[PDB]
Amino acid sequence: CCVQIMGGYFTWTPDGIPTLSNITIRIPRGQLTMIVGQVGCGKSSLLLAALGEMQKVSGAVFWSRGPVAYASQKPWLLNATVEENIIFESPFNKQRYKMVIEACSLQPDIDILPHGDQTQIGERGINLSGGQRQRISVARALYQHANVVFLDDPFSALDIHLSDHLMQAGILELLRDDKRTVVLVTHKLQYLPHADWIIAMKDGTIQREGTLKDFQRSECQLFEHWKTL
Amino acid sequence: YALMVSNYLNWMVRNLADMELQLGAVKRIHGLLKTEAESYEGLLAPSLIPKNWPDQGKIQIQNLSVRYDSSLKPVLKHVNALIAPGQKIGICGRTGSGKSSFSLAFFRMVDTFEGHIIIDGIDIAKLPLHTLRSRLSIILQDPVLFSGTIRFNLDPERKCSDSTLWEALEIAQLKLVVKALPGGLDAIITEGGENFSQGQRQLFCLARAFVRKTSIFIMDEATASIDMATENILQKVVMTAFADRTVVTIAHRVHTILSADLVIVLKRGAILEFDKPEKLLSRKDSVFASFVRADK
Ligand SMILES: Nc1ncnc2c1ncn2[C@@H]1O[C@H](COP(=O)(O)OP(=O)(O)OP(=O)(O)O)[C@@H](O)[C@H]1O
Numbered sequence: 001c002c003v004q005i006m007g008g009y010f011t012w013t014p015d016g017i018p019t020l021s022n023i024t025i026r027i028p029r030g031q032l033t034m035i036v037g038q039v040g041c042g043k044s045s046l047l048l049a050a051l052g053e054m055q056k057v058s059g060a061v062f063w064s065r066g067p068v069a070y071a072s073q074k075p076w077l078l079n080a081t082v083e084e085n086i087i088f089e090s091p092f093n094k095q096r097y098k099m100v101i102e103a104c105s106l107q108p109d110i111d112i113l114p115h116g117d118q119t120q121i122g123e124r125g126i127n128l129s130g131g132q133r134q135r136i137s138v139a140r141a142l143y144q145h146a147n148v149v150f151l152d153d154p155f156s157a158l159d160i161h162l163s164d165h166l167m168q169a170g171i172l173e174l175l176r177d178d179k180r181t182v183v184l185v186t187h188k189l190q191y192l193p194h195a196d197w198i199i200a201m202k203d204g205t206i207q208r209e210g211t212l213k214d215f216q217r218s219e220c221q222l223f224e225h226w227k228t229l
Numbered sequence: 230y231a232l233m234v235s236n237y238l239n240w241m242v243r244n245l246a247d248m249e250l251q252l253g254a255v256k257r258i259h260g261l262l263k264t265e266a267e268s269y270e271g272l273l274a275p276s277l278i279p280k281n282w283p284d285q286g287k288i289q290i291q292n293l294s295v296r297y298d299s300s301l302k303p304v305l306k307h308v309n310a311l312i313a314p315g316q317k318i319g320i321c322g323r324t325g326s327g328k329s330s331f332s333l334a335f336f337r338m339v340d341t342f343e344g345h346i347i348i349d350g351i352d353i354a355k356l357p358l359h360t361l362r363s364r365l366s367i368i369l370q371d372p373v374l375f376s377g378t379i380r381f382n383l384d385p386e387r388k389c390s391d392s393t394l395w396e397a398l399e400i401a402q403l404k405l406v407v408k409a410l411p412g413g414l415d416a417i418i419t420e421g422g423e424n425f426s427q428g429q430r431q432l433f434c435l436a437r438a439f440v441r442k443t444s445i446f447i448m449d450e451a452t453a454s455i456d457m458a459t460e461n462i463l464q465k466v467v468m469t470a471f472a473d474r475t476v477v478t479i480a481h482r483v484h485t486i487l488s489a490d491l492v493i494v495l496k497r498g499a500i501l502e503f504d505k506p507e508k509l510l511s512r513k514d515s516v517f518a519s520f521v522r523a524d525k
């Protein structure tokens with residue numbers, strides 16, 4: 001019932017080809033959904049478009065906008081304290097703070113920092129591995145407390161240890177929140193039985209949606225998802 | 230002349246101040262002109278080195294003990310490995326084990342205080358670093374691009390053929406995409422790659438490495454950004470097209486390492502029972518068994 005599109009048409013530049021054409025979207029509130037597809041297929045573009053970013057050629061986009069939490073497809077950061085960019089101008093909550101951190105399991109990496117939590121990081125601050133970068137980006141939306149939370153490829157950098165720990169702890173905490181709708185995308189399909197709603201697209205066009213019954217109708221797509229098993 | 234002074238004396242002072250600023254800036258640049266020794270010249274003869282030198286690509290490391298700077302603790306130590314032509318061997322593990330470090334152990338990116346590596350016939354301690362990295366290759370974990378065109382993005386020089394360019398695009402599964410692009414591998418990659426996706430840019434980097442006919446090189450979990458379908462197709466195509474080549478594979482996806490000849494597992498600062506994949510998975514005793522079972 002929440003944010004959705006009827007016959008969406010989207011494009012980066014109005015002079016070129018329309019990026020998205022006839023896309024129809026639906027995410028239920030308080031639901032964990034995933035969007036998968038090919039590389040370059042058009043999965044982040046639809047999302048940025050849903051964030052008012054992409055020039056829509058046509059389509060209608062209904063909301064509830066909200067201060068939607070966000071983590072870009074590549075990690076970004078501010079030139080300020082670990083605590084600073086993690087807080088992102090929010091009422092500091094020791095409980096929520098350490099909860100988010102232990103969700104991202106960043107504590108060992110915070111101990112190794114010269115000033116730990118109050119370590120100035122960034123293009124001005126000190127450099128660090130893109131793994132920490134990704135975990136911090138995720139923490140940005142986690143501690144964000146936002147109703148509609150959003151993630152883009154939070155798993156690319158992390159290995160399976162941190163991916164499992166993060167998704168379990170943090171995502172299970174999000175779904176543990178009352179109605180904190182959280183939307184993401186992934187490159188691995190193992191948590192697809194852990195998704196509630198699913199969006200499948202390829203080459204800039206949606207293909208399918210629906211958790212269990214709507215999947216089983218595909219032998220092809222589901223054998224593809226079964227290539228890894 | 231008193232009027233003259235009353236006029237120009239104040240300009241004299243103000244220009245003294247402004248030039249003081251400017252010369253402080255010049256001194257800043259100059260204090261930066263002081264630079265550290267990079268040691269490009271290696272203590273080995275280029276005449277002793279043949280042209281197509283890294284022919285076999287057999288690699289034997291032993292007690293290889295590295296560290297980024299002298300102050301930091303050793304990040305990888307007491308490691309030994311004889312690597313045959315071994316068309317495809319694998320290295321994997323959890324984060325921080327130093328696998329990217331060991332990847333950079335070849336190109337002497339790291340201080341390697343103890344131990345040594347032998348590329349067929351010779352150590353690493355004597356090559357010219359330019360010659361060193363000129364005849365090898367690597368695929369960085371992160372994709373980094375160049376503002377320009379596919380000609381310039383792949384070929385800094387021009388000493389290549391469009392045939393081979395399209396070949397590298399194809400074997401990386403890019404040519405199919407590029408066909409849709411109006412440039413003809415002549416479009417413009419803008420500001421490090423803000424036109425294409427993460428995985429797109431990673432693919433470009435893979436292909437760029439692939440431009441080199443080198444038969445020995447390495448990859449740093451290049452497939453992390455890549456989805457599963459292209460992962461399978463790409464790893465297959467590269468194994469086939471590089472059936473002769475000797476590639477060392479970092480894999481953030483063990484499902485990709487299940488195919489290599491040898492599997493190399495790093496726990497903290499060394500290997501734990503590097504072996505063929507079948508033996509390690511059927512023994513179950515290695516932690517790579519758990520790595521492949523948590524995925525399934
Ligand atoms: N900033 C941009 N400007 C113009 N075109 C873009 C931009 N980003 C991506 N594109 C194009 O739009 C298409 C869709 O890309 P999208 O943003 O969905 O990346 P993605 O597929 O989500 O990322 P990944 O490939 O890692 O899943 C791609 O083919 C790409 O060439």
Ligand SMILES: Nc1ncnc2c1ncn2[C@@H]1O[C@H](COP(=O)(O)OP(=O)(O)O)[C@@H](O)[C@H]1O
Pocket residue numbers: 297301304323324325326327328329330331
């Ligand atoms: N530029 C650097 N400076 C100091 N230490 C580094 C640097 N890069 C990596 N390290 C250290 O090396 C270890 C492993 O590095 P790396 O191989 O890049 O990561 P991984 O093992 O996950 O591939 C980490 O524990 C990290 O602390």
Ligand SMILES: [Mg+2]
Pocket residue numbers: 043044045073426427
């Ligand atoms: Mg994207």
Ligand SMILES: [Mg+2]
Pocket residue numbers: 328329330370
């Ligand atoms: Mg690494």
